[PDB]
Amino acid sequence: WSWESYLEEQKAITAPVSLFQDSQAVTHNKNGFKLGMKLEGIDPQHPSMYFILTVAEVCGYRLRLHFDGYSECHDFWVNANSPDIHPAGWFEKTGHKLQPPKGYKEEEFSWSQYLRSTRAQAAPKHLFVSQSHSPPPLGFQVGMKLEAVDRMNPSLVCVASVTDVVDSRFLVHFDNWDDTYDYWCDPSSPYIHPVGWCQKQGKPLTPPQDYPDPDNFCWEKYLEETGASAVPTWAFKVRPPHSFLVNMKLEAVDRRNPALIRVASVEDVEDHRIKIHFDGWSHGYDFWIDADHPDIHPAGWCSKTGHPLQPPL
Template sequence: MNCGVIQAVERVVGTVCARADQTLRHDKPKMPWQVGKSGFSWCKYLDHCKAKGAPVKLFKDPFPYLKNGFKVGMKMEGIDPDHPSFFCVLSVADVQGYRMRLHFDGYPDNHDFWVNADSMDIFPAGWCEKNNHKLQPPKGYLPSSFNWGSYLKMSRSQAAPRNLFANKTGSSICPNAFRLGMKLEAVDRKNSSMVCVATVSDLIDSRILVHFDSWDKMYDYWADPTSPYIHPVGWCKEHGHKLTPPHTYKSSNEFSWDIHLRETKSSAAPARAFKQRPSSGFRRGMRLECVDPWVTSLIRVSTVEDVKNHQVKIRFDGWPKEYSFWVDDDSPDIHPIGWCQKTGHVLEPPLEDSLTAPDSVGCPTPGCRGVGHIKGHKYSSHNNTLNCPYAPQNLNKDNMVPDRLIGKPENYECLSDQSEQEKSMKLEGSNLAGRPQEGRNPVGRPPKWRRIDTSSETKLPMALDNVEIKNEDDEKDRKRKKRRIEEEDSSSESKPLASSNDVQHELHEAVWEPGYEPNPDSNLPSFWVKHSIYLSDYTKQVASLGNPVSWSEAEVARFVASIPGCESKARTFLTQKYSSGMVF
């Protein structure tokens, strides 16, 4: 009877809440561009704003011709957007219209990223092996032992069909004039004011991988011959722009292209290889649809706020100017009006005035609905400003998600200038190196840090030296403590065992002040002398009882009971049938 009453009350409460929510929706004023309950009409919106949509001809690939055939769970190979020189094993984690979220196998969801189904950066399984590219296997696998057939069988998954990929060939044979190892001058995409010495480090179809000499590979990027960010050798001198040389040069005045080409045994890319495209023709006030850079699963109604060279400044309609950002005019993240409707993707409408006030239920940030998280796709929502990607304190933070491959700087060594393999234009493997020459200051962006290989034989001499130093210190401490113990023994024949409070205090200090590095090198012994101070009394007791191997069950229990804090465990040793000294 009580259960029936409770269920009836729950139904009544649910009905009341539903009616209240429906009443709030009806009371909410309907915007002129709304269609139905929550639909959005571009025609009504453009008519209301007296604006025009960006012409379809301004977009590189305006509308897809085919449907998105990728399914969740399909596996493939693709380029890591944060490390463009890496080809990784990926899985489809989510699909929305013509877009999909890709996941790095073996890594957390924080590093997932969204791409269009016709992206040129994804390839079918086995593409790397066929085209002589190194595939980075999932975490925990070795490149030499990874096999697609066994991996798909073990993970009980399927590879994405080849006919779903827009990049049908992906050949390393480049039809343009660029060749592997050629030099050029390229713009740093993370700092467009810098033009630096660069090298063609990889080729796919008509695209080249731009690598900045002496920089980490995470700054690399793919470009085609029409890109406005790559220039022939001598472009900076001709246009009066400052050229940033490799970081081994003290200043740009010391750098000479002739000397650098001779030292690296390389050649300059011919001027005919560069075919810079004109700007697309966007104008201020044009409307379009754009991917939200803070929550990349969303696409919002947007306006071109400004135009500069080959970039456009985007502002989400209804949002403050603090949320404006720059993108390339050929970016795959900008689309003509109607793209979401045609591909089946949800379009976020303009921010209404009623939403600029903080929501008492969800995230208090104005305009935020609690979607997304500053720690990436591992969390799909949030309810506070601390984790809100739109919160003012989080807008300019670029490193909220830790790098997938690079860890703490203290555990990494600097990437060097060009290795001997790169100088001979083999360009294989990682670009490990040393630091700049002594007395020379680095120029340009500092390189990132790479993990130190502690298993290398070159680290053994240093590790052995540290072991000898530690052993000498340990020996001095042992002698000093032994002398002190002998003096105490001479003054008193008997000494009570340490109390439980003393042991607990010592354990607390051992945890918070252990006397050694919390993360010591694997080749160095622990500094254990401090932990053995209170063992001297028990070692004497053990010596008086004889060899512990020959102890009986009663002798083992007696010894355990004498240890502070272990009195209750002594009974367990007495009741056990096999608790002799040998087992102990």
């Protein structure tokens, strides 16, 4: 199988490298992660929470992470340039809570002790793109409030708060809802708006879960009661729409079997998202994904990084 022969055969064009973020395209960085290394990272399902993680597998510029003490059914894959992982020690130096290995107490866990117990090595610091050392996102402080789209229920724009800040990004949290709805963004995210945006746009605003008087939610009173400030309007930036076009081909990780990356096509577009189709598979497996998502890549990425590529059905 080759991309060159397949494109000639299909009279098709790949999405150029120029349409991707540098982080999605870069193939010349080596993967320094090695089996058994220990580190810290967010649970992709609960992006506000941090766990002790171990490198269980490496494949090209990707690695599979295992939650120490928990079942292997929870293992997940990230790129070696992921900002959602951090070196041993990072949580304690930056004000983040550790969920310790199964059966430990928070107060009970110490990296020194754990590494002695396991005789394991911590992943070296120099591997990690994110250590909370770079300038923060301008204008977004922890504790400030804003209006945000519930990416799980995208018809809802909701009262939300900044609850975390790491390097150039911040975490959006939906007031008094499960942290499973939280997501990381930057100032240009198309999913966030200043306080007052819904009322100015004539959209209903979804109030906090279990808000005492759900009927008459008022931002001014809520901000006062909560000792909170709005993110100032100047901080919000326009992200330009992406330049991907329908029928362009690319490589995308399989959501159902994330170990796998497949030949894919752009099936549809929005301003900030693309709809992925896996060539040769049912359109029933098609899915929408943000254009900046870390698991889409230009054609060639797998061969240049050493990751196997699944040809079309």
